[PDB]
Amino acid sequence: RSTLIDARRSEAMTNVALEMERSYRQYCVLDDPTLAKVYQSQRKRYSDMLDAHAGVDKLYQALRQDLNALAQLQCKDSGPEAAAAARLEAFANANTEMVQATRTVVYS
């Protein structure tokens, strides 16, 4: 079932995930509504790829929850809120796990 198109998608998801965290920390510094729109656009782009990544589970469910928990931008003293920052970190590690898991199933 899984082809390298699913591998390219895991690539692109982690790329958008880091772009999400970049926009999040940029927004908390500058407090600009346009950056918020970009962040939700990137979050929406990640959501769409996760849907296309359905199948290919535990790791899938956790990625969807982190995506939902990151829906609102909470800032505190020019940085993300502590709970928001912990979610961003967890979301990035689940994405790393997703790349590993995806790459084993596309070739074994």
Author numbering: 49 to 104, 108 to 159
Provide text from the study.
Here, we report that the outer membrane lipoprotein QseG functions as an accessory protein that directly binds to and activates the histidine kinase QseE via its C-terminal domain. QseEF, a TCS responsive to multiple ligands including phosphate, sulfate, adrenaline, and AI-3, is essential for the virulence of pathogenic Enterobacteriaceae. Notably, genomic analyses reveal that a third gene qseG is co-transcribed with qseE and qseF, encoding an outer membrane lipoprotein anchored to the inner leaflet via N-terminal lipid modification. Collectively, our findings establish QseG as an endogenous activator of the QseEF signaling pathway via a conserved regulatory mechanism.
